[model samples]
Target: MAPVKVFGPAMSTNVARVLVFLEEVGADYEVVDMDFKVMEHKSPEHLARNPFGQIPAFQDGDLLLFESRAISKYVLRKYKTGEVDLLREGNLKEAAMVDVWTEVDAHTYNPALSPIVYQCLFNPMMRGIPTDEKVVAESLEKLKKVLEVYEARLSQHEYLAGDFVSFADLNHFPYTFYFMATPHAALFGSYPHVKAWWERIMARPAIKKISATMVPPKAKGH
Candidate 1:
């Protein structure tokens, strides 16, 4: 098999998700960084790969794919080589857990934390004001509430996917990593189980290696 190639920015959590998956699967691949600031991703060459010009496009010979989530699942399928892959491990009960956890990251985790991060960092960095205090407060509350449920669930099950920390648990690495690293880190401490889980995940050697590679921007503001 030709070496897989992934195109995206390392700073992007969406992109990082796929990169982390590659690491987990021990797959050899090349990372082509896209410059979001200069709009390098919009170039015709990249557009040909990802029509939407989104980062995290995948290519392996004739097999090209887009969308971070789908690419991640595909990588897992191929890398696992059919030995109890992440997608197949969850039978009946854990399947629902996987779905629910994945959805929660989308509807609850990302929605809540992303707005706050954008407001607190991205917007301001772009010379726009931070998200207003009222909005930040609301987002924080929503994220906190959702985490409480996760805290409860985690208290019973060692991993979100089940007894094992499958890709189901791996799926949320980006969101959880962002929450703990951004200025909103305090928002993660409200729930004991959630905090513990975050610590456990972050402490993983793979996570530590990845997190250390994420350098803070040199910009004064944002």
Candidate 2:
């Protein structure tokens, strides 16, 4: 048995985030696919792992963990060997920059981008509803501003935090991967530096492996 077990559907972006870090660091982990249809994620058993009943309820031995990003940091610190330093350990300034970008991922970038994801991708696909163009356009404009900031920052630094790859850069992989499915996937390419950054992160073997598992299973109808 693997030392760590993660509970969620294979297609979950949240679960994929955690899986990517584990793979990058070469951690022995198992994935438990929860049934969302039957509310398996919210069952008492899963609730024990994450009280709020999120998709991923991570357990590493006796330690129970919730929140995907938190799990990423834990696995990176514990499992990573060699010269790999995704969190930029031992360098205070670089480490702090990693944390700073993490905040931007959670607060600034995701908020600007998530609404368009719902309107353009999730809602219309799941429920067969019309794409809300207004919502998509508004969110796109906000995301353009956000990516402009990203482009400027990337021009100054190779990775989000600095010269080295970090958890801050990894935090972006899942959502941005999905963003590539939308019509404006071209938007990232519009900015040369952001485009370069995206291509750089996408080339990681861990991410390339996880990408195949990030798609939902086919559904005939609702």
Candidate 3:
């Protein structure tokens, strides 16, 4: 068996964060697909891994962990080395920079983007609802503003944090790549710096290898 096991929906962003973490940290693991469609996530078997019925949960021998952000930090601290170690390593200043950007990912990116994207896009598509133009436009506007921050940041530095790409960068990326790959690709075109940053991160051998599991886009009625 792989040293670690991650349990969660394959397509969920929260789960994707952990997957991306494992990619960046080079952590080997098994992914148990908790298909929400069949209500598998609600089963007692899965609950033993995550009492909250949340994902993606991480299990490493005697250690079991939940919460995506916390798990990301844990995986980085536990598995990664060399340059990847800088993701969670270094002194207070460097650490603070990582914290600053990661905080932006949590408080700013997800809060502002995820719900809007879900309501306007993912959930609607899941239920075979027609695309809501008003919601899409509003969400796109908000998404543009959210990405503007990234664009400005990348213009000043190569990654979300200065110099080396850290856990902060890796954790925030998968979803953005998802967003870019969605119908919202136009939203990205306007922000050149942000587009460049997305390309840079998604081009990583780590992300490329990991993202091979990414499912192809489904049609509206799928």
Candidate 4:
């Protein structure tokens, strides 16, 4: 098969999600770069792939997909041969647990973290605007409660779904990576098990490699 074609800005967290999965699964893939600031993703050509005009559209042979999480699941299922089975080795119960945590990351985790990132990271980094204290406070409060759940769950198991890392844990990387880089990093530091689990994820060679290439928006000339 030809290399999987991934389309998005390289720095995009959503795009990064799929890239990380590809690395972990040892898939042959290539990134077709796009520029969001220049409205490249909204171009008619790109819009055909993702009707909502989103970054990180994907193509693998006859399969074309959008929504980063969905793309990650497809790649993991199709290309995870002889690689670490981040999808729980296709065990039914294990896959269910992975699905549960993956949904948590989607509905609970990313929504809470995104506002915080928009206020804290993107505003300052991209727009030269200052962080909004009110938004930050509320977001942190919500995130704190979420982390409490993570702390309790992680205390029982090394990773979110169970003892081994799964797509659920991998799903947190893009947003969490930025969170840890900010002053609010202390929020995660307050929970020991969550911190340790994050550390383990960061230490993975695949994550480390892709993360190194994940430049800031400014660096990408946005």
Candidate 5:
């Protein structure tokens, strides 16, 4: 079988999500690098793969897919064997749990976290603008409520979907990882279960390996 091909900038969290799951599945793949500063993602070739010209277009043989989570889920399903199953072996209830949390990560988690990251971290680091305290404060207020829910959920189950790790939990890793780089990391300490859950996820060898190499590209003026 041909190795899978992933096209995107390495620093993209969406791309990172797919790559980390690929690592977990031990899939043979190669990255086709795209430079955002040069607008490579907007090229006709990339647009052919993704109409939105987003980072992380995936290809496996004749199949072409975009959307990082969809690609991650596809790979997990395609690679499942007698010994390997990441989607809880298609168990109805377990899969439902995974779906629920995956949606939560998408709708609840990302919205709450994105503004703070873009305004406080990305703008300052990449655009050389000062952090916006007002935006950061609002993002934190939203995140705190989300974390409280996570803390309660995690207290009941070791992982988001259940005791064993699943795509749902893994989906949050990239954004949460970036959030840790911000000063508000101590916020997690206030929620014991959430903190413990985060530590366990971070300890995974595949996650650690991917994170070690997931360096953000240099800013354009640099």
Candidate 6:
């Protein structure tokens, strides 16, 4: 009868990722704000929830879950709240497609984009460190190539895992939302289909609601 508990700072993208899906299903849940500044995430109680000392340690009933992407899939499967079957459990190949793209985001897309997020995001906001243009440039080049594949794949399919949206597409929301907050947000505009895909996701009511909790870091110009 109790809402699920999410242990993490509200601003964390990883935590936001899980929140997106939870809202999508209208699941009962509450975020227990864990301050990293106080090293609460490393405390004995939190470590028991996630040994890795990660941002999101989800508690549902008696089950404790981590890994934001994996947690979204579990929520979708258990609640079946709406029409969107994120994992495509009824369709094996589609589910396989979902799995493939989720891994693709993790392996290829994330690696390429993360450095930029950290440099442009944390450097200025968290540490007051100057933005490193060189790193941003290199990561931009890498991200461009990644999006090229997205452009081609998305041109042929409405969503990453085929015609309908799946967990693969949702996996992109957290970080990409931050990327959009950066001045480089316009990069998505260059790739029409990729840009369009993001717009559609952005327009979703659940995304809109969950987005409010995210902290948008200002670009250096701001």
- Quantify all predictions' global Cα lDDT against the true fold: 0.75, 0.85, 0.73, 0.86, 0.84, 0.86
TM-score of 4: 0.92
lDDT of 3 by residue, 1-222 (tens): 457888876577788778887877677788888777777877898788789888788888888999988887788788757756645466778888988888888888866666555665576667666666776677667767888778888889888878777767877665665565456556666888877776777788877765667553632112
Model 6, TM vs. native? 0.94
TM-score of each: 0.88, 0.92, 0.87, 0.92, 0.93, 0.94
Among all windows of 10 consecutive residues in model 4, the one with the lowest summed lDDT is: 213-222
Q: Write the per-residue lDDT of candidate 4 for residues 1-222, one digit (tens) a residue.
A: 799999986678999999999998787899999876789988999888999999899998877899998898899888767657888755999989998999999999888888888887888888899999899899888998999999999999999999889989999998888776666767777999999999999999888878877854432121
Please identify which of the two predictions, 1 or 6, would achieve the higher TM-score against the true structure: 6
List model 2 lDDT by residue over 1-222, tens digit each: 457998897578889999999889888888999887788878998889899988787888899999999888898888868757888778899889999999999999988887776777778886678899998989999999999999999999999998888889889887777777777777887899999998898899998888877863321111
Give the lDDT of residue 161 in candidate 4: 91
Off by over 4 Å in 6: 217-222
What's each prediction's clash count? 1, 0, 0, 0, 0, 0
lDDT of 6 by residue, 1-222 (tens): 888988886678999999999888888889999877789988998889999888899998899999887787888888895566778878889889999999999999988888788888877888789899999999999999999999999999989999998889988988888887776777887899999999899888888887778757442123
Instruction: Please identify model 1 stretches exceeding 4 Å from their true place.
Output: 81-85, 126-129, 217-222
Please state the error at residue 10 of candidate 3 in Å.
2.9
User: What's the residue-level lDDT of 82 in candidate 6?
Assistant: 52
Tell me the deviation in Å of residue 191 in model 5.
Answer: 0.8
> On a 0 to 100 scale, what is the lDDT of residue 16 in model 6?
92
lDDT of 5 by residue, 14-130 (tens): 998988888888888898898778899999988999989898999998889999989998988887754555688569999889889989999998899888778766889878999
Report the error of model 3 at residue 141, Å: 2.2
What is the Å distance of residue 94 in model 3 from its true position? 1.0
lDDT of 1 by residue, 4-72 (tens): 988986767788888877877778888888777789889999999999988888998998899988998
Worst 10 residues of 6 by lDDT: 213-222
